Amino acid sequence: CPLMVKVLDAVRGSPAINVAVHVFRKAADDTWEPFASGKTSESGELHGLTTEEEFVEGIYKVEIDTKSYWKALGISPFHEHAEVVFTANDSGPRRYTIAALLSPYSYSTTAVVTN
Ligand X SMILES: O=C(O)c1ccc2c(=O)c3c(Cl)cccc3oc2c1
Q: Is the backbone of residue 13 left (phi > 0), alpha (psi -120 to 50) or beta?
A: left
Q: With CB under 8 A as the rule, give the number of residues binding a copy of itself.
A: 20
Binding mask 10-49 for ligand X (x = CB under 6 A): ----------------------------------------
CB of 25 within 8 A of CB of 78? Answer: no
Euclidean distance between CA atoms 26 and 12, whole angstroms: 34
Q: Which of 24, 69, 70, 107 binds a copy of itself (CB under 8 A)?
A: 107
Q: What angle do CA 22, 60, 89 make, to 5 degrees?
A: 140
Residues 70-99 close enough to bind a copy of itself by CB under 8 A? 78-81, 83-87
6 binds, among ligand X, Ca ion, a copy of itself, none (CB under 5 to 8 A by kind): ligand X
Does the annotation list 45 as a binding residue? yes
